[PDB]
Design a protein around this ligand. Sequence first.
Ligand code: ET
Lengths: 186, 185
Amino acid sequence: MNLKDKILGVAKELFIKNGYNATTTGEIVKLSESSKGNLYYHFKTKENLFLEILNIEESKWQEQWKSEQIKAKTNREKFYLYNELSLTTQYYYPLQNAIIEFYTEYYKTNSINEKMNKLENKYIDAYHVIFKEGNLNGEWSINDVNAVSKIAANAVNGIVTFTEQNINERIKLMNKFSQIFLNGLS
Amino acid sequence: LKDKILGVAKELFIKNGYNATTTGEIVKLSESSKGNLYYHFKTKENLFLEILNIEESKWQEQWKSEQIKAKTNREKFYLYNELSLTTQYYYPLQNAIIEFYTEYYKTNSINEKMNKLENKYIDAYHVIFKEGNLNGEWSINDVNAVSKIAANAVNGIVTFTHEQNINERIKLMNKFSQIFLNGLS
Ligand SMILES: CC[n+]1c(-c2ccccc2)c2cc(N)ccc2c2ccc(N)cc21
């Protein structure tokens, strides 16, 4: 509906620019020329709207990587390439601040917390594959891929989120990191 | 004095967070007025930044003290990372800082002042690596880039690790430290 995807996009950008709390359902309903009833009928609650957006963001990113990893022969390159993509992509990573702001608040309520761990698993799994495969084709030796994946992901999210900033300078930084990390596995 | 408003402000931010905390509450509980506040700290965000600075100073003190127990710079690195994780695990202001950051991490006035604050945390890393270069523990050409990489990555691990059990968090953080220094060699 031109009244469904209409509110989804407005919510996305707002959550990206002002975070979760600052973004009120009212303003969303405002800039998206709709009613509190529409938002309600389509998303019920504000927190529900946010999880749906995270659900979509997770898919897009998943698809984008699914078709981008092919361009990298060795997993060592898929590592470099994945980290660089997370810098330029428009999916998921641009919403980290809001995600953490949301996670910390409703982490007690296990209802939606469970939902986020599910979204948290996929975003991590990407690294799992890279390292698991790297083991199979003898590119490196990692006894605990689960630990290395978690470390890599969060470490990277850190560079992406905490580092306007010159897009080229960021990539050189991300590559440097990528190099240092992989040479540490060896 | 102006210390009264700051004291109360931190408590409210700790208790109810940054967004829920209004300048009004800070006013009445401090026996002051919105006027005297606008005078001393201009805006709310500026007050919160004034509290973070003071906090940073306390952090420097903690580091200044704790760091003397790490003989080599390679040990300081491990220590600094683990200490960030644990200290921030039970640090009250954490949630309030999370909100503020995710809110004003895109404001020319507050961003410049924010980066200046984060840079002091990053600079700790600059010392360790520079000292390490001299002390023959390693050899890093661009310390500035490497310190930013270490700092933001460590912060990532500390911030996005949605996993529980503090025992596991320290393990992963120690592992990162090993992996990271192992790659600088
Ligand atoms: C929680 C404060 N804080 C921030 C920080 C995060 C967001 C805004 C400002 C500073 C930080 C930011 C970067 N990049 C690197 C290290 C730290 C850090 C390190 C230790 C600590 N004990 C607090 C730390």
